[PDB]
């Protein structure tokens, strides 16, 4: 169905894009590795930073510790207040 | 009285200004590296003529930051300046 | 054979979509690009209609899953059709209506409500994030 | 004053709070010149804390004389705009260790996160190039279950930079792709970074017709044109 | 004087959508009778000829390019398609958000086709290729699925609601 | 603190996630940054208000400070018969130890939304000219003001200093 | 740990294309991909089923996550026909309803992921780790069928991109699957559809989304 | 002052402009039109003797221009008066021919909304203001910009040339304005002293004095040589000063703002040029702002430079355009 | 804080290479107003049109 | 509500006395979504390693792509200096408005 090729100005543009992408990933990954109170720059920092923000979703290098599973169900005060809101919404009618 | 309470509430709202806790300065890789490279060439080229000391550390010979090993979340730090 | 675009415009020559001409004309002259072909207007009307049919259908799935009454009606559909078929003439009523009253005041008092907390999840599938809180404190 | 109807139904705890706030709650900075200065300067990690000093002395990590050399060697990498090719493992390693010495990490950079960075760049540029490719063309055989050859230009990578604008870092790179990637037809692009001067239209100056041979500044730019 | 809005109101997809809507409504009515049978065993029809008034159809009024009349016709033609799925009651804010979403989708379609028409790149597509890639880059991945949707919603759903009506009518004849 | 919330608003979203107990330093710094972002929306909103040649801050003046600041759009703040301040702040209190307001809304049928008639549309724009001044005084036609009812209408910070030739 | 399901992964690879004794790394990567996909399926299904108000995950609650692929749920319905009515359907809106190696090719298809018992599956995938209730009525059979489909489709597209990389390599200068083939097959299978992107294209903000399950 | 009041614009008419000979008016709407009015009641159809067909259409002596996809925030007429330049919030500036009523060229160099386009004096090349804190110099034959004017802290609101077309003046929302060299690009002057977003700027036909108005209702004048303040002007309400215009021969400033007034200012009172005061009193002078019923601190006190103020009765003035013969034109929309 | 700004200005000129007489004369040039040009809008007796020489402007 | 009138006082503190009704509702529904996303990403970053530096990481993760960038004047000055290297082209001298070439104008196009 056809071959698409690239031109030189687009090559300089995409190479500058990649050149800034590298530093923008590793500068936040260094902050995560320092937030983990360590000194080495492991691969879980980079995989977490690319999973949460860019969602590139690289298959497993350390992607079993990165995969954190919370259910995001609310507290007991919040379901109480939702009961109060539903009670007023049914007592209004 | 509600009058002094209202004027002191409006005095309180007129004094609160927020700053952001995290602001990412819009900059580049390439202009930062080229600034560093040109400053390294022209810093290694000339001399300092100090009063007592010169700025820089090993193989920098310019104004270099003094970020600590801890407190990496601090907003300011010291720099090097030729002290007489 | 998958229809070419010329066949689609040749069929839009005969069958106009739901969204009429002047709505497409207002959105055209609101976005620039004045076009004088009626079949491109009908094609964009059909495209917007199909996209919101998909969004409202996914909202219908999200609103039929998140209610216990709908999944219980789908589970006990023919099981209660048995009770309705055994609901013959008046000799034969005493052995039924042990479960009919509760789901009778559930299924006949339940109308399907297109809700903000349903559409926000049906378009969070599509890329949005419509975060409306439930109270304001 | 005149806001008695509105400032009164705030509760007593809220008003007793909001008659106390002031300026001087923080330790921040807000001078943007100084923020740009601290984002510009290269910083080396030092040690004053004794527990961290014994923690960095035990794991055989060195004094700041090595981290300053590591800053310089991470900066001196031929970054990928100059080489016109995607970087390799040693360039990745040296740049990432220089960045990690900038942020404070005095440890060692792992050897698998470099390959992770490589695959990250792979999928990033593949996403960008694919959503530029499927806009100049409608691939009929693809996107279906039953013309020639096109080159993507910089105007196209500006045109689908905005029709799908979410695909970028939103850093300097997208700013320069929006600001400087489009060129007017007298732009003189196939150049040698200096031939767009005005004096290269007006005649190479010759040499040494003088006892003291001091020349003019319009000849110095012809001298630097050759290099 | 008939306004330009009510021109194609009976021309091929509005009668089919109206047949879908009245089949949904008149098999939502047999269920009320059988639910009444369950209780003893213990309608507001559509109208599309609504015009504005003849005074606002005068050429001294901008009856074609103001926000509120187009917003009301979008509201009507989106509530006409949010009930072909099965909804029968909605919050106002839900239809307001759905009309905003349809407006932004149609504006993005016209903006993408506009950007493909007036680009100064060295490779502009032809008349049909720009339409195909502006259908591709937002919504439908091929042109043909539109004809599938007209097949799916007005050729398949109508016989589905029709034989559900026939089976429920035979069931009501078999009950009493 | 600052004026957004100590805990009374941010903490009721912290509980909406599921997070039970967090320190007040977290809520202080977090609410300070949240209302800094609110002011950052407000400043681009007043910029769009000024360049749209208006005096109120309509809902489409903050909805264009969103696209500029790349914020995901807040859909559902524009409805039929778009008038200036289409009054819709009917938020209903709910009791307890503190206050809870939940924004009641009445459900409606579809067949009273399709069988509902279309509103009035005004005339298309025209202009009309007159003389504001002929030599530096105002000729007092019906189209001119009276210069003494300008006192009783507007305060001198939205009408400025009256002087005449 | 890992490497629990290696022989069964090889058995499911054999049905799609040629086997040629795939290495330890390809089987390990397919195991970690399937172990991630099962956790994402259980998290999304538990989030959907808790808001109904029942911690027991229903059989239709996991078919909810694959409701778009009508051919695949028809395949699931035919797969549930040898064990000797969806809530979102068109009929179920309304309240009331009326009344020589071919044998070796086949036995690999009868070999499944969790066919024997859910003993190694429950502590490998961690069924009890994230589920608040007791879901096991038919969630394990669907969670076996989904992983069989995931491995089949994943090795199918990995085979096709290995063949296309082979023809690209023999055209540039002029047998086993590797981790790079599985990773680019994952990149092919994890691209978001165009209709699930249309409403964020002209506004510039980083698209946060969910991992697409097969 | 001849005031052009536009009636049926439901708060969706942005800043307008009049041409020179005052025959065409251009108003940018919030729904992506440019509306073109013949101010003489003329045909505005440009037949040119062809007379082919189409009297079946409705011409209300007014043409609409639909090329934008965002809201038009500024609009500028060429001194040739045959072309129109419309800047929108979709990130283009478009060019329109005023004698066939179509679009000619799209101009794409911004990534934020465009707020103030303005031609040159000689019509050579136009400058542009936008939200990205930079002004851009263009040319009508080049699709992409020629200079980038960067150096402001907030975004640029207004733009104007020196009357020779050799410097550029940009005012910005960080309470300052700048004078830019048009060739080297770098700023030559920075004028400090305001307390609000500078919204309209204008430089006198002499060229030695710069005047601008902020959103604090205070006009002020500097001289471009010293760069410091000669004096200010304190008669407008604490509100926006939408437009600004100059006397053709001499210095009399006409300010049409947001407080529904059009005010007249003597530039040469407190300077070293007194400009020929009369030799020999009034009753209304110094008693109008000596009423002060609202309070001393809650009222405005005008400078000695303000002489007259024409109120418009509930319509605001978007545009003041001083014609050649001591007749100014104001323009705005009837607000309720 | 304006006398400190004056001192910062004087030290800036001293370090950026302005002689004491040269800095004094540039200060005195900066203080006095722009005088009056009698041909201010270029009156049509002693004023000329701009050149149409196809070059861009240069201050 | 307390935050509707607190937003009234906030809007009045920056001299905004005319606005519509749903504008504090829009500000509250922005602040809810922003704080919910920030606290969810901060719960992720605290399970990784709550506290204030955790919130700082979670609001530095999303400062990088949506809101107004910080101190952009020196990058814009560098970019301006890259554009203001080229001297200005030759202009027409026939005192009018010159168009681009005909293919670079919106006229030779077809529907």
Q: Tokens in use for F52? A: 């749209």
Q: DSSP 3-state assignment of C106?
A: helix
DSSP three-state, residue H221: strand
Rounded CA separation C65/C72 (Å): 10
What are H254's strand-pairing partners?
H245, H264
Query: Subunits with at least 3 CB pairs below 8 A relative to chain H?
Result: C, D, E, F, I, J
Q: What distance, in Å, lies between the first and last C-alpha atoms of chain D?
A: 74
CB H289 within 8 A of CB F161: yes
Three-class SS of residue H94? strand
Judged by phi (left if over 0) then psi (alpha if -120 to 50, else beta), residue A57 lies in: left
Q: In sequence order, which residues have a C-beta less than 8 Å from that of residue H192 and are 6 or more positions away?
A: H175, H176
Identify the three-state secondary structure at position G178.
coil
Yes or no, beta carbons of D181 and A15 under 8 Å apart: no
Alpha-carbon distance values, I14 to H74, H183, H321, J9 (Å): 46, 29, 48, 51
Phi-psi region of H140 (alpha: psi -120 to 50; beta: other; left: phi over 0): alpha
Resolution in Å equals 3.9
Which class for B50: exposed (0-12), middle (13-18), buried (19 or more C-beta within 10 A)?
A: exposed
Q: Radius of gyration (Cα) for chain D, nearest Å? A: 29
Please tell me whether residue C20 adopts helix, strand or coil conformation: coil
Indicate the burial class of E42 (C-beta count within 10 angstroms; 0-12, 13-18, 19 or more): exposed
Q: Quick one: CA torsion of D184, D188, D194, D199, rounded to 10 degrees?
A: -90
Six-digit token string for J5: 């009138």
Q: CA quadruple H184, H188, H194, H195: dihedral positive or negative?
A: positive
Chains contacting G (3+ CB pairs below 8 angstroms) = A, C, D, E, F, J
C-beta atoms surrounding I11 within 10 Å? 10
Q: CB–CB of E149 and C50 under 8 A?
A: yes
What is the Cα–Cα distance from G212 to D24, expressed in whole angstroms?
A: 49
A37 vs J: CB within 8 A: yes
Dihedral, J88, J91, J96, J97 alpha carbons, nearest 10: -60
Could you give the CA distance from residue H118 to residue H85 in angstroms, rounded to a whole number?
Answer: 8
Q: What does the alpha-carbon distance between residue J27 and residue G137 come to, in Å, rounded to a whole number?
A: 46
Per the CB < 8 Å rule, is J104 touching E118? no
Radius of gyration of chain G (CA): 20
Produce one character per residue of J49-83: b if its CB has 16 or more CB atoms within 10 Å, e if not: bbbbbbbbbbbbbbbbbbbbbbbbbbbbebbbeeb
Q: Which residues of C touch H67 (CB under 8 A)?
A: 32
Place of tokens 């000669």: H230
| Residue E120 touches partner J, C-beta closer than 8 Å | yes
Which of J9, J31, J60 would you mutate first to test chain F, the one with the most F CBs within 10 A?
Answer: J31
Instruction: Identify whether the C-beta of residue I55 lies closer than 8 Å to the C-beta of residue J91.
Output: yes
Packing angle of the helix pair G24-52, G6-16 (nearest 10 deg): 90
Nearest-angstrom CA–CA distance, D161 and D178: 8
d(CA F48, CA H115): 10
Dihedral sign, Cα of residue F32, residue F38, residue F40, residue F46? negative
Rg of chain H over CA atoms, in angstroms? Answer: 21
**CB-CB contact of H307 with H265 (8 Å):** yes
CA distances from G143 to G76, G139, H247, J3 (A): 11, 6, 83, 47
In the numeric block, the tokens 């497993």 are attached to: A60
Residues 6+ apart with CB under 8 A from G157: G185, G188, G189
Which residues sit opposite H331 in a β-bridge? H4, H319
Q: Provide the β-strand partners of residue H201.
A: H212
Give the CA angle between residues D214, D219, D221 to the nearest 5°. 130
The one-character DSSP state at I51 is P
Tokens of E134: 């502006």
8 A C-beta contact, residue F163 and residue H235: yes
Closest CA to J29 of D207, E168, C131, D221: C131
Q: Which residues of D touch A65 (CB under 8 A)?
A: none
CB neighbour class for G160 (10 Å; exposed up to 12, middle 13-18, buried from 19): middle
Among positive and negative, which fits the CA dihedral F69, F70, F74, F80?
positive
Question: Phi/psi class of residue G26: alpha, beta or left (left: φ > 0; alpha: ψ in -120 to 50)?
Answer: alpha
Chain C residues close to G199, C-beta within 8 Å: 123, 126-128
In angstroms, rounded to a whole number, what is the distance separating the alpha carbons of residues G159 and G16? 9
- State the burial class of residue G61 (Cβ atoms within 10 Å of its Cβ: 0-12, 13-18, 19+): buried
The SS3 assignment for D31 reads: coil
Q: What are phi and psi of H160, to 5 degrees?
A: -160, 150
Counting Cβ atoms within 10 Å, is residue H189 exposed (0-12), middle (13-18) or buried (19+)? Answer: middle
Distance CA G122, CA G128 (A): 7
CA–CA separation, J84 and J97 (whole Å) = 23
SS3 (DSSP) at D150: strand
Domain boundaries, chain G: 1-214
Residues 47-86 of A with CB under 8 A from C: 81-82, 85
Using CA atoms, how far apart are residues I34 and I40, in angstroms rounded to an integer?
12
Q: Tell me how the structure was determined.
A: cryo-EM
Please count the other Cβ atoms lying within 10 Å of the Cβ belonging to residue C70.
20
Q: Return d(Cα G100, Cα G80) in angstroms, integer.
A: 29
Q: Which residues contact E57 (CB under 8 A, 6 or more apart)?
A: E1, E3, E51, E63
Euclidean distance between CA atoms D109 and D117, whole angstroms = 12
Closest C-alpha to E53, from H336, H58, F113, F122: F122
Interatomic CA distance for residues D74 and D101, integer angstroms: 9
Task: Name the nearest CA neighbour of H16 among H321, H236, H261, H262.
Answer: H321
- Please list the alpha-helical segments (H only) found in chain I: 2-15, 20-31
- Contact status of E143 with chain G (Cβ, < 8 Å): no
Is residue A75 within 8 A of residue A83, CB to CB? The reply is no
- Report residue C5 as tokens: 């675009």
Query: Smallest Cα–Cα separation from E6: which of C22, H17, F38?
Result: C22
Q: Beta strand pairing status for H306-311 and H319-322? A: unpaired
CA distance E119 to chain H (A): 9
- DSSP per residue, H46-76: --TT---S--SS---SEEEE---SS-EEEEE
Residue D33 has phi, psi (to 5 degrees) of -60, -40
Provide the 3-class DSSP secondary structure of residue G105.
Answer: helix
> Strand (E) positions, E19-144?
89-90
Residue F4 C-beta-side C-alpha neighbours within 13 Å? 25
| H228: Cβ contacts below 8 Å, ≥ 6 apart | H222
Q: B13 vs chain F: nearest CA distance in angstroms?
A: 7
Cβ atoms of E101 and C55 closer than 8 Å:
yes
Other residues' Cβ atoms within 10 Å of the Cβ of residue D81: 18
Whole-angstrom distance, CA of residue H142 vs CA of residue D182: 11
Asked if B80 and B63 count as a contact pair (C-beta separation under 8 A), the reply is yes
Q: Considering only residues 16 to 75 of chain F, which have any Cβ-Cβ distance to chain B shorter than 8 Å?
A: 29, 32-33, 35-37, 39
**Residue H209 in contact with residue H203, Cβ under 8 Å?**
yes
What's the sign of the alpha-carbon dihedral B8, B9, B15, B16? Answer: positive
- Using CA atoms, how far apart are residues F61 and F58, in angstroms rounded to an integer? 5
Task: Residue window 37-66, chain A: list those with CB within 8 Å of chain F.
Answer: none
Q: Which of G132, H275, H16 is nearest to F125 (CA)?
A: H16
Lookup: tokens for D163:
């029709």
Q: In 3D, which of D23, J50, J34, J35 has the Cα closest to residue F2?
A: D23
- Its sign, for the CA torsion H189, H194, H195, H199, is negative
Q: Are strands H2-6 and F127-131 parallel, antiparallel or unpaired?
A: antiparallel
Which of D103, D139, D146, D166 is the best substitution to test chain A (most A C-beta atoms within 10 A)?
Answer: D103
CB distance E127–J110 less than 8 Å? yes
CA torsion sign for F29, F32, F35, F36 is negative
Contact, J28 vs J7, CB < 8 A?
yes
> Phi and psi of H118, rounded to 5°?
-160, 125
DSSP string, chain F: --SS-SSTTTHHHHHHHT-----HHHHHHHHHHHHHHHHHHHHHHHHHHHHTT-SS--HHHHSHHHHHTTPPP------SS--TT-------EE-SSS-EE------EESHHHHS-------BPP-EEEEES-SSSS----TTS--SSTTTTTS-TTTS------
Closest by alpha carbon to H89, among H55, H51, H117? Answer: H117
Partners of F71 on chain G (C-beta within 8 Å) are: 205
Residues of G in Cβ contact (< 8 Å) with D126? 187
Contact G199, E107 (CB under 8 A): no
How many whole angstroms separate alpha carbon G38 and alpha carbon G46?
A: 12
| Site from E123, E131, E144 to mutate, D interface, most D CB atoms within 10 angstroms | E123
Q: How many of the other CB atoms lie within 10 Å of CB of C2?
A: 14
- Distance in Å, alpha carbon of H6 to nearest chain J alpha carbon: 23
Query: What DSSP designation does C3 have?
Result: P
For residue E37, how many other CB atoms are within 10 A of its CB?
Answer: 15
* Other CB atoms within 10 Å distance of the CB of residue H50: 7
DSSP type of residue B15 = T
Cβ atoms of F144 and F133 closer than 8 Å: no
DSSP per position, chain A? ---EEE-HHHHHHHHHHHHHHHHHHHHHHHHHHHHTT-SSB-HHHHHHHHHHTS-----SSSTTTS---------HHHHHHHHHHHHHHHH--
How far is I29 from chain H, CA to nearest CA, in Å? 8
In this structure, what token pair is assigned to residue H110? Answer: 């911004």
> d(Cα C24, Cα C37) in Å, to the nearest integer?
12
Chain I touches chain D, with at least 3 Cβ pairs below 8 Å, answer no
| Alpha helix positions (H), chain J | 2-13, 22-48, 52-60, 73-83
CB neighbour class for A83 (10 Å; exposed up to 12, middle 13-18, buried from 19): exposed
Q: Which long-range contacts (CB under 8 A, 24 or more apart) does G177-180 make?
A: G177/G22, G177/G23, G177/G26, G178/G23, G178/G25, G178/G26, G179/G25, G179/G26, G179/G29
A84 touches chain F (CB under 8 A): yes
Q: Which residues of D touch A18 (CB under 8 A)?
A: 80, 86, 121, 124-125
Distance between first and last Cα of chain J: 55
Element housing E41 (H / E): none
C77-85 vs C68-75: helix crossing angle, rounded to 10: 60
| Other Cβ atoms within 10 Å of D189 Cβ, number | 10
DSSP state of E152: I
| Closest residue on chain A to D152 (Cα) | A6
Long-range contacts of G155-162, Cβ-Cβ distance < 8 Å, separation of 24 or more: G155/G12, G155/G13, G155/G16, G155/G17, G155/G30, G155/G185, G156/G16, G156/G17, G157/G185, G157/G188, G157/G189, G158/G182, G158/G184, G158/G185, G159/G16, G159/G17, G159/G18, G161/G185, G161/G188
Rounded CA gap, G135 and G50, in Å?
12
Query: What would the two tokens of residue H147 be?
Result: 């200079």
CA–CA separation, B40 and B60 (whole Å)? 7
Contact D137 E133 (CB under 8 A): yes
**The token pair that represents J20 in the structure block:** 């519509």
D146 to chain E, any CB pair closer than 8 A? The answer is: no
């Amino acid at each position: 169905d056809g071959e698409t090729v690239i031109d030189g100005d687009v090559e300089e543009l995409l190479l500058d894009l990649a050149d800034d992408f590298v530093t923008n990933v590793t500068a936040f990954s260094c902050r995560l590795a320092k937030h983990r109170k360590s000194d080495n720059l492991e691969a879980r920092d980079i995989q977490l930073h690319l999973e949460r923000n860019w969602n590139i979703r690289i298959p497993g290098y350390s992607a079993d510790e990165i995969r954190s599973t919370r259910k995001w169900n609310p507290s007991q005060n919040y379901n109480q207040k939702l009961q109060s809101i539903t009670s007023d919404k049914v007592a209004a009618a | 009285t509600p009058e002094e309470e209202t004027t002191q509430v409006l005095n309180g709202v007129s004094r609160s200004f927020p700053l952001p806790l995290e602001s990412t300065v819009l900059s580049s890789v390439r202009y930062r590296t080229k600034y560093f490279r040109m400053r390294e060439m022209f810093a290694s080229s000339f001399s300092v003529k100090p009063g007592y000391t010169s700025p820089g550390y090993g193989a920098i010979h310019s104004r270099v930051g003094c970020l600590d090993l801890d407190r990496t979340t601090d907003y300011k730090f010291r720099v090097r300046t030729p002290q007489p | 054979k998958d229809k070419t675009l010329e066949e689609i415009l040749e069929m839009m020559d005969s069958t106009p979509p739901i969204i009429p001409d002047a709505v497409i004309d207002y959105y055209l002259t609101k976005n620039g690009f004045n076009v004088a072909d009626v079949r491109v207007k009908r094609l964009l009307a059909l495209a917007t209609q199909k996209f919101v049919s998909d969004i409202a259908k996914d909202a219908y799935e999200y609103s039929r899953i998140r209610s216990s009454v709908a999944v219980s009606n789908a589970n006990n559909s023919q099981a209660r059709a048995r009770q309705l078929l055994q609901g013959q003439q008046q000799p034969g009523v005493q052995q039924i209506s042990q479960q009919q009253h509760q789901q009778n005041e559930k299924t006949t008092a339940s109308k399907v409500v297109l809700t903000v907390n349903d559409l926000s999840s049906a378009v969070a599938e599509y890329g949005l994030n419509i975060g409306r809180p439930d109270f304001y404190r | 004053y005149k806001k008695i109807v509105m400032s009164l139904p705030l509760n007593d705890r809220n008003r007793l709070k909001m008659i106390t706030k002031e300026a001087g709650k923080r330790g921040f900075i807000f001078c943007s010149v100084f923020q740009a200065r601290l984002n510009n300067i290269p910083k080396i990690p030092i040690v004053t804390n004794p527990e961290s000093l014994k923690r960095v002395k035990s794991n055989n990590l060195k004094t700041p004389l090595e981290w300053s050399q590591d800053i310089m060697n991470g900066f001196n990498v031929p970054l990928a705009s100059e080489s016109h090719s995607l970087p390799d493992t040693d360039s990745f390693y040296l740049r990432m260790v220089g960045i990690a010495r900038e942020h404070g990490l005095v440890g060692t950079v792992d050897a698998r996160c470099v390959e992770l960075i490589s695959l990250a760049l792979d999928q990033y540029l593949k996403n960008i190039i694919e959503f530029t490719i499927d806009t100049v063309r409608y691939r009929r055989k693809k996107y279906s279950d039953y013309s020639g050859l096109y080159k993507s230009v910089s105007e196209m990578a500006a045109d689908k930079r905005d029709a799908k604008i979410k695909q970028l870092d939103d850093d300097k790179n997208e700013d320069e792709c929006a600001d400087e990637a489009k060129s007017i037809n007298n732009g003189n692009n196939s150049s040698k970074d200096d031939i767009g001067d005005i004096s290269m239209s007006s005649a190479v100056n010759e040499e040494l017709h003088e006892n003291r041979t001091i020349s003019l500044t319009n000849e110095d730019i012809y001298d630097s044109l050759s290099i | 004087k008939q306004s330009r809005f009510l021109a194609n109101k009976d021309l091929g997809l509005t009668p089919k959508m109206n047949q879908n809507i009245t089949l949904i409504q008149q098999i939502r009515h047999i269920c009320h009778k059988i639910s009444l049978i369950r209780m003893l065993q213990s309608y507001t029809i559509i109208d599309d000829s609504l015009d504005i008034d003849p005074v606002s159809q005068l050429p001294t009024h901008d009856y074609k390019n103001n926000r509120e009349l187009i917003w009301k016709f979008m509201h009507k033609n989106i509530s006409k398609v949010a009930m072909a799925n099965g909804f029968e009651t909605a919050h106002p804010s839900a239809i307001n958000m759905l009309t905003e979403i349809a407006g932004d989708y149609l504006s993005n379609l016209i903006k993408t086709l506009k950007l493909h028409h007036e680009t100064n790149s060295l490779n502009r597509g032809t008349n049909v290729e720009m339409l195909q890639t502006t259908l591709l880059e937002n919504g439908i991945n091929r042109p043909d699925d539109l004809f599938s949707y007209v097949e799916s919603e007005f050729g398949k759903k109508t016989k589905k609601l029709q034989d559900i009506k026939q089976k429920l009518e035979s069931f009501l004849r078999a009950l009493l | 603190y600052t004026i957004w919330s100590p805990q009374d608003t941010v903490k009721d979203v912290a509980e909406s996630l599921g997070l039970e107990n967090i320190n007040d330093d977290v809520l202080k710094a977090l609410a300070m940054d949240v209302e800094y972002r609110i002011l950052e929306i407000i400043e681009q909103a007043v910029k769009f208000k000024r360049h749209s040649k208006r005096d109120v801050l309509t809902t489409d003046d903050v909805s264009k400070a969103l696209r500029v600041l790349n914020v995901e759009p807040l859909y559902g703040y524009y409805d039929g018969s778009e008038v200036n301040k289409a009054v819709s702040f009917s938020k209903v209190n709910t009791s307890g130890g503190q206050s809870v307001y939940y924004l009641d809304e009445e459900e409606v049928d579809f067949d009273r939304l399709i069988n509902e008639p279309l509103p009035q549309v005004p005339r298309l724009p025209t202009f009309t000219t007159h003389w504001l001044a002929v030599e530096g005084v105002q000729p007092a036609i019906i189209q001119n003001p009276n210069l003494n009812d300008i006192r009783v209408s507007q305060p001198p910070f939205i009408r400025g200093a009256i002087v005449t030739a | 740990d890992k490497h629990k399901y290696r022989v069964e992964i090889q058995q499911m690879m054999f049905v799609s294309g040629e086997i040629n004794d795939p290495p330890v790394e390809t089987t390990s990567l397919i195991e970690d991909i399937v172990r991630g996909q099962v956790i994402e399926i259980l998290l999304q299904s538990n989030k959907t089923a808790h808001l109904r108000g029942s911690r027991s995950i229903l059989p239709e609650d996991v078919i909810f996550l694959i409701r778009h692929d009508k051919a695949k749920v028809n395949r699931l319905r035919t797969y549930l026909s040898w064990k000797d009515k969806l809530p979102w359907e068109l009929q179920f809106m309304f309240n009331e309803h009326p009344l020589e190696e071919y044998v070796h090719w086949s036995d690999c298809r009868q070999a499944s992921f969790t066919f024997r018992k859910n003993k190694r599956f429950k502590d490998w995938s961690g069924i009890s780790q994230l589920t608040e209730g007791k879901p096991h009525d038919d969630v394990i059979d669907i969670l076996g069928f989904l992983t069989f489909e995931i491995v089949c489709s994943l090795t199918e597209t990995a085979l096709k991109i290995k063949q296309r990389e082979q023809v690209l390599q023999t055209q540039k200068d002029k047998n086993p699957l590797k981790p790079r083939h599985i990773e680019e097959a994952w990149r092919v299978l994890q691209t978001i559809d165009m209709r699930h992107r249309a409403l964020t294209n002209f506004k510039g903000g980083r698209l946060s989304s969910k991992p697409i399950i097969m | 002052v001849c005031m052009y009041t536009f009636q049926n614009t439901n708060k969706d008419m942005s800043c307008l402009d009049f041409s020179d000979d005052c025959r065409i008016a251009a108003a940018g709407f919030q729904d992506s039109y440019i509306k073109i009015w013949s101010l003489d009641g003329s045909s505005l159809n440009n037949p040119n003797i062809a007379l082919n067909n189409n009297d079946k259409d409705e011409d209300p002596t007014c043409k609409t221009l639909v090329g934008h996809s965002g809201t038009v925030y500024s609009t500028s007429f060429s001194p040739d008066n045959k072309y129109l330049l419309s800047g929108s919030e979709d990130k283009t500036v478009r060019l329109w021919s005023m004698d066939t009523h179509t679009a000619l060229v799209s101009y794409k160099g911004h990534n934020h909304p465009v707020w103030d386009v303005s031609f040159s004096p000689l019509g050579h090349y136009f400058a542009t203001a936008s939200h990205d804190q930079t002004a851009r110099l263009w040319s009508c034959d080049h699709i992409y910009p020629l200079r980038i004017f960067a150096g402001h802290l907030n975004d640029v609101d207004c733009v104007s040339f020196h009357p020779n077309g050799c410097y550029v003046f940009t005012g910005s929302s960080d309470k300052t304005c700048r004078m830019w060299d048009v060739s080297t690009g770098d700023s030559v002057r920075l004028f400090l002293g305001h307390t609000a977003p500078v919204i309209s700027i204008a430089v006198c036909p002499d060229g030695r004095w710069l005047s601008t108005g902020s959103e604090d209702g205070i006009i002020n004048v500097w001289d471009i040589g010293t760069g410091k303040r000669l004096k200010q002007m304190r008669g407008h309400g604490k509100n926006a000063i939408y437009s600004l215009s100059y006397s053709k021969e001499g210095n009399v400033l006409i300010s049409g703002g947001a407080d529904h007034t059009v005010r007249v200012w003597d530039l040469k009172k407190a300077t070293t040029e007194p400009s020929a005061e009369p030799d020999e009193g009034d009753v209304t002078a110094s008693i109008n702002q000596d009423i002060k019923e609202y309070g001393r601190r809650r009222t405005v006190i005008p400078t000695s430079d303000l002489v007259a103020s024409f109120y418009t009765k509930k319509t605001p003035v978007f545009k003041v355009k001083f014609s050649r013969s001591n007749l100014a034109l104001a323009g705005g929309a009837f607000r309720p | 804080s304006a006398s400190d700004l004056n001192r910062i200005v004087l030290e800036y000129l001293n370090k950026k290479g302005y002689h004491r007489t040269e800095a004094m004369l540039r200060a005195e040039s900066g203080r006095t107003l722009t005088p009056q040009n009698k041909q201010s809008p270029a009156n049509t007796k002693t004023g000329k049109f701009p050149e149409q020489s196809s070059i861009p402007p240069n201050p | 509500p307390r935050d509707v009138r607190l937003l009234h006082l906030l809007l009045a503190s920056q001299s905004i006395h005319q606005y519509e009704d749903q504008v504090p509702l829009q500000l509250m529904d922005f602040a809810h979504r922003y704080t919910q996303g920030v606290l969810k990403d901060a719960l992720v970053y605290n399970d990784y390693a709550l506290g204030v530096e955790d919130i700082r990481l979670a609001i530095a993760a999303r400062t990088q792509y949506q809101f107004k960038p910080t101190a952009p004047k020196e990058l814009m000055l560098q970019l301006a200096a890259e554009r203001n290297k080229k001297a200005l082209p030759q202009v027409m001298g026939t005192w009018g408005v010159r168009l681009p070439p005909e293919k670079y104008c919106l006229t030779a196009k077809e529907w």
